[PDB]
Design a protein around this nucleic acid. Structure first.
Ligand SMILES: O=C(O)CCCn1c2c(c3ccccc3c1=O)C(=O)c1ccccc1-2
Length: 567
DNA sequence: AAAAAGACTT
DNA sequence: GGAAAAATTTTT
DNA sequence: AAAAATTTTTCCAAGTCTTTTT
């Protein structure tokens, strides 16, 4: 039965407390390892051998990745092998001395032949598995938190595999290791039925911590960090925190000018420490850069943010581009994605970066005397709850709002307005540096979308031919009588006019999303109310922008704030 | 403090 | 999330 | 149909800021 809870109209919980009641059926473990059949052989130095279950499982993972470029890299093969030997018996360790003499060319083909027979199942054996995954979602994918049933995001644990990560990770190849129930920590209420552990096992511990959001927790062997199973974005716990993110971003708008004037005068300060902080805060505001946390050497790939930049990442140019005082940025950020931008800065910012790069080696930190802790404690003394991450949400949302007013033409149709919406949502991705939407299939599919626009251009032309025939026959065979034909064929041209201005609009839309990714900005940086306030203003239906799960996530926006909403 | 953990976003 | 995969749905 | 374009699942990490230990 259709209910629909409006958690936004309820009262908030006092400091710390996230809930009072919590019950779940625990996580879902990856199905146990099924050993390779008799005809699938593994060869070492040409000779045949059958590996034990723990060592064969680690071999399968490598065999499945074998098509890739990374399996030829030295760090990958060093790491993989250290973790492979660990999972071997004493007999195998003595025979298998190197990865190079190991032949996986028969295991890499079985998993490619097992994929063919997986995508070519019968209608009864495919609908049997579709009902097996559906009963899991029904029994494990939901939980009860405070009088209401909310959906879980990651209810299943990730199966073991080989670590890869992004970029030139120093730990690529290491075994991700299987998570057993003895590594799992269950969080729930005292008065709630504690989930029964999978037969033959026991949990690590059951705790009742109402100060936290998570239902299940464990530790990953790669980094050593703690992984969690929290609720999907449609919930109160996640949605309330999402609303408070944009509310803190609204309170920044009201103090942004005072903050901009204070750091502009701070470039002229007597302390070198206060200069760096202001120049850092300038790049966080102008270029929308990440704070830049300090990460341990060898634990993750060499990536930087703002406070972590080095003298090798910036190149100063007094001339270049026709413009003066240009700072050429060239570095790798989060997820190892290249940030390259030649941007003109102000008089005092340039002569400051020259003082920061002075008599320093290329691997030294540009912003010494500065880390993320100093910058954030400074911002907290400027406004309550302010952090460098807010400047990203602010510069995103205020840009969406003003670009929605600048790019929307009132006299246009609804499909043409979505093109104007996507142009505004493009400007936010050309700020936060979000890139690439499948450019490999986008070469053939675009040229085959163009041949379907020309196929409807002929129908409009054949309609304009039939209306010109009616305008010429309304004269020789009189009006009123035989003029009703000029009426119905004038509405046929109109039905075909906006049908073409839909197809040609979806073409310009797809061609402009080449090296742009609308996703991360659409779901994490932009205030949904700005969009709902635009949809209710121009009569553009909400489903023609947000899909089911986005509408489900942003239900707090669709109900609250009308057309008169200003960020 | 200030590393290390932990708890969330992205 | 972004990309590859699988699941649908719409073209030929 | 049977292919092909779409849409929807599915695979898998890494930042930020806070809070505890040392
Ligand atoms: O599918 C799920 O139920 C897990 C969602 C978690 N989740 C994950 C990633 C992510 C990336 C960007 C925004 C949100 C998420 C997110 O919300 C990501 O890059 C990743 C790698 C490995 C495991 C999980 C994630």
């Amino acid at each position: 039965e259709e209910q629909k809870w409006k958690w936004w109209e309820e009262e908030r919980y006092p400091e710390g407390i996230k809930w009072k009641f919590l019950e779940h059926k625990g996580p879902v473990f990856a199905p146990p390892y099924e050993p390779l059949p008799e005809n699938v052989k593994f060869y070492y130095d040409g000779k045949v051998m059958k590996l034990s279950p723990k060592a064969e499982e680690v071999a399968t993972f490598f065999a499945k990745m074998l098509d890739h470029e990374y399996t030829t890299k030295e760090i990958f093969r060093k790491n993989f092998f250290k973790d492979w030997r660990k999972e071997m018996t004493n007999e195998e360790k003595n025979i298998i001395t190197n990865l190079s003499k190991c032949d996986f060319t028969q295991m890499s083909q079985y998993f490619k032949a097992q994929t063919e027979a997986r995508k070519q199942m019968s209608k009864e054996e495919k609908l049997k598995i579709k009902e097996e995954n559906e009963k899991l979602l029904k029994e494990y994918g939901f939980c009860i938190m405070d009088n209401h049933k909310e959906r879980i995001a990651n209810f299943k644990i990730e199966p073991p595999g080989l670590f890869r990560g992004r970029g030139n990770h120093p730990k690529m190849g290491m075994l991700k290791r299987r998570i057993m129930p003895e590594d799992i920590i269950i969080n729930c209420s005292k008065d709630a039925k504690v989930p029964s552990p999978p037969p033959g096992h026991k949990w690590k511990e059951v705790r009742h911590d109402n100060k936290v959001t998570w239902l299940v927790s464990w530790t990953e062997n790669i980094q050593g960090s703690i992984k969690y199973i929290m609720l999907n974005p449609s919930s109160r716990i996640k949605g309330e925190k999402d609303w408070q993110k944009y509310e803190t971003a609204r309170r920044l708008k009201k103090c942004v000018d005072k903050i901009r004037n204070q750091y502009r005068e701070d470039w002229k300060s007597k302390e070198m420490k206060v200069r760096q902080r202001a120049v850092a805060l300038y790049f966080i505001d102008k270029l929308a850069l990440r704070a830049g946390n300090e990460k341990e050497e060898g634990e993750t790939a060499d990536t930087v943010g703002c406070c972590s930049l080095r003298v090798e990442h910036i190149n100063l140019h007094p001339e270049l581009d026709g413009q003066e005082y240009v700072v050429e940025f060239d570095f790798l950020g989060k997820d190892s994605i290249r940030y390259y931008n030649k941007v003109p800065v102000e008089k005092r910012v340039f002569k400051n970066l020259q003082l920061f790069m002075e008599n320093k080696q290329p691997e030294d930190d540009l912003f010494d005397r500065l880390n993320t802790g100093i910058l954030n404690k400074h911002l907290q003394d400027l406004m309550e709850g302010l952090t460098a991450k807010v400047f990203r949400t602010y510069n995103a949302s205020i840009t969406l709002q003003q670009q929605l007013k600048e790019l929307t033409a009132p006299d246009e149709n609804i499909p043409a307005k979505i093109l104007s919406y996507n142009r505004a949502n493009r400007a936010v991705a050309i700020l936060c540096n979000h890139q690439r939407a499948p450019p490999k299939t986008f070469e053939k599919s675009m040229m085959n979308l163009q041949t379907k626009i020309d196929a409807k251009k002929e129908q409009l032309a054949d309609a304009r031919r039939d209306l010109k025939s009616a305008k010429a026959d309304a004269k020789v065979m009189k009006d009123a009588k035989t003029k009703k034909v000029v009426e119905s064929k004038k509405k046929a041209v109109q039905r075909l006019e906006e049908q073409l201005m839909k197809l040609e609009v979806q073409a310009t839309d797809r061609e402009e999303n080449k090296q742009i990714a609308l996703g991360t900005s659409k779901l994490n940086y932009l205030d949904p109310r700005i969009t709902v306030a635009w949809c209710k203003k121009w009569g553009v239906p909400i489903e023609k922008i947000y899909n089911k799960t986005q509408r489900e996530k942003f239900a707090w926006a669709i109900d609250m704030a009308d057309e008169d909403y200003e960020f």
